[PDB]
From Swiss-Prot:
Ca(2+) 2 binds at D55, N57, D59, E61, E66. InterPro entries: EF-hand-dom_pair, EF_Hand_1_Ca_BS, EF_hand_dom, S100/CaBP7/8-like_CS, S100_Ca-bd_sub. This is Protein S100-G. Signal peptide: none annotated. Keywords: Acetylation, Calcium, Metal-binding, Phosphoprotein, Repeat, Vitamin D. The modification Phosphoserine is found at S39. SUPFAM superfamilies: EF-hand (SSF47473). Residues 10-45, 42-76 form the EF-hand domain. Ca(2+) 1 binds at Q23, E28. Transmembrane segments: none annotated. GO terms for cellular component: apical plasma membrane; basolateral plasma membrane; cytoplasm. GO terms for molecular function: calcium ion binding; calcium-dependent protein binding; vitamin D binding.
Length: 76
């Protein structure tokens, strides 16, 4: 969605590796940049503050409602 089928993709590929492909988790956010740009998860203390930067109780999941702050991280 943020690019030619590059953002909505994570949301069906890794978001799908776990349950539906319309929700994410910590084991499928990292794989995102890794495929597109692994070092996109900077901001220091990353690998975790990317989860709270979107939701605060997803329960370890990130639906496309919280995966939006990342949608502006692919296009470029």
């Amino acid at each position: 969605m943020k690019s030619p089928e590059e953002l909505k993709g994570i949301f069906e590929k890794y978001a799908d590796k776990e349950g539906d492909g319309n929700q994410l988790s910590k084991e499928e956010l990292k794989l995102l940049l890794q495929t597109e740009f692994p070092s996109l998860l900077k901001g220091m203390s990353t690998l975790d503050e990317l989860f709270e930067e979107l939701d605060k109780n997803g329960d370890g999941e990130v639906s496309f409602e919280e995966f939006q702050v990342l949608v502006k991280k692919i296009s470029q």
